[model samples]
Target: NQKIAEEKRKRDEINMVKDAIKLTSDFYRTIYDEFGKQASELAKELASVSQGKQIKSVDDALNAFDKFRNNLNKKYNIQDRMAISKALEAINQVHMAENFKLFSKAFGFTGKVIDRYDVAVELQKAVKTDNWRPFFVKLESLAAGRAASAVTAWAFSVMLGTPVGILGFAIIMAAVSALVNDKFIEQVNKLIGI
Candidate 1:
């Protein structure tokens, strides 16, 4: 009984660390979501700041921009530098503010609590409410994109069912081939030429 109890105690200690690390990761993800939302707003502001009169024409927008687009290129270079600076600043803030390892170590101890009761308390945490909105919100775009792909796939299948559409690929390959001799004929021709 004592050996089994000790074994259970060790397992519980590691489980607590694992759970604490998971909780910390979950909170970090939430903070990242908020930061991402703020970033979208910042992008809108930057777009407005950079928007200007038609220093660029429609033809410039269409093609052959490599010859005469130094101004737009310069504008992008400036904006890119500013954006990268802001990103680095944000990264430094998060890296310095977090203490997840410390939190995990402090809460991970199973010494004060008995082995049997620790199992009970850990089980209770499973019942405790955690916000699920953040996880589900991530699926919105994925679901929409999947739906669009499914519809397009069905249309493509119908379009491909036509006789001309189905055989066109093979027909194209055969018609485009430049081969004019069989393998046996080529060998005989080479022998005769030699």
Candidate 2:
């Protein structure tokens, strides 16, 4: 019982750090959820898409992301930054921030209890900007374009009870239209190979 109590104590220590780190990651969580919702809507709009194969793909990525974050506190001892840096790197590599804008936004949004913490030094440079509008606009469009293209492709290929393919194309076009009010989606769609 004593050993188990000690183990629990250590776990709680690491868990505190883990919980603190989670606040900085809320930005990505937003992206994950927004894309997921869009994927589901796309599946429904297509009216018989590829059994939600595209949603599954996005879900898989998010699951891997979730797994990484969940394991952050599993280690019983809290010490330095090597493992932390490595884990953050894998996810950050998906889209390296020019300004760590995501974290900055999260940092500003996080409660004061964690706000005073020095977690910034653990990751990398922390850059605060006067404008996050451009940053998030770009990010959201990229995510939306990729999700749309992927689900569209999945719909086009899958055998369904509805009209074989034209319905898929129509749905994709409609989804794209909804987001194309500005000039960004076309550029992003081309770059994303959608």
Candidate 3:
């Protein structure tokens, strides 16, 4: 049991490291594109360097965020960063929620499916207005909806198709089980070096 748990942590850590770089890159690019010059410089500063010293760990990354703020100083200030941070936070939530594949009906049963376009439009709206809370809320519900549909679809498949359905169910459950925990946010935090 101990060994198994450690193995899981190790795998998660590897994933988290990968996620950290991608997320950092995403946040950097998004903000850079939004604000133009300063954002571009900030993004360049955060890039993972091979030869020179780089943001080495979570603590270092968090400090980088602090430096990002300090560099902006009174010209932009924390309010701008707070909004940009929400933009960053919002994008991360959007990424996590986007992974779920919802189905309206599967195995002759009506399963809830959140439309990808709908999600995209909502997030797009959030991006334009900077009203991200609604987008996050919507994403959360969609995430849960997909989880529910996974169980329902699996059960329905088992009931209606038996052997074939079980096979399908097992496959889906494998995918669903990967997201069974909300460790995803923790993984994102690691990515941001939070």
| Candidate maximizing lDDT | 3
Candidates sorted by TM-score, best first: 3, 1, 2
lDDT of each: 0.26, 0.30, 0.34
Writing each residue's lDDT as its tens digit, candidate 1 over 1-194 gives 99999999999867867764664444334433543443223322222222221112223222222211232233334444334333322322222222322231333222221112221122123113222122122211212222222111111122122222212211111111101101122222222121
Candidate 2 accuracy as TM-score: 0.17
How many backbone overlaps does candidate 2 show? Answer: 0
The residue pairs found clashing in candidate 3 are 20-191
Candidate 2: stretches off by over 4 Å: 1-63, 76-141, 147-194
**lDDT score for residue 171 of model 2:** 24
- Give the TM-score of each candidate: 0.22, 0.17, 0.26
Compared with the true structure, the alpha-carbon lDDT of candidate 2 equals: 0.30
Q: In candidate 3, what are the lDDT values of residues 42-130, reduced to their tens digit?
A: 22332211112211233332333333323334344344434433333333333333222211122121334443435434534543453
Task: Identify the candidate with maximal TM-score.
Answer: 3
lDDT of 3: 0.34
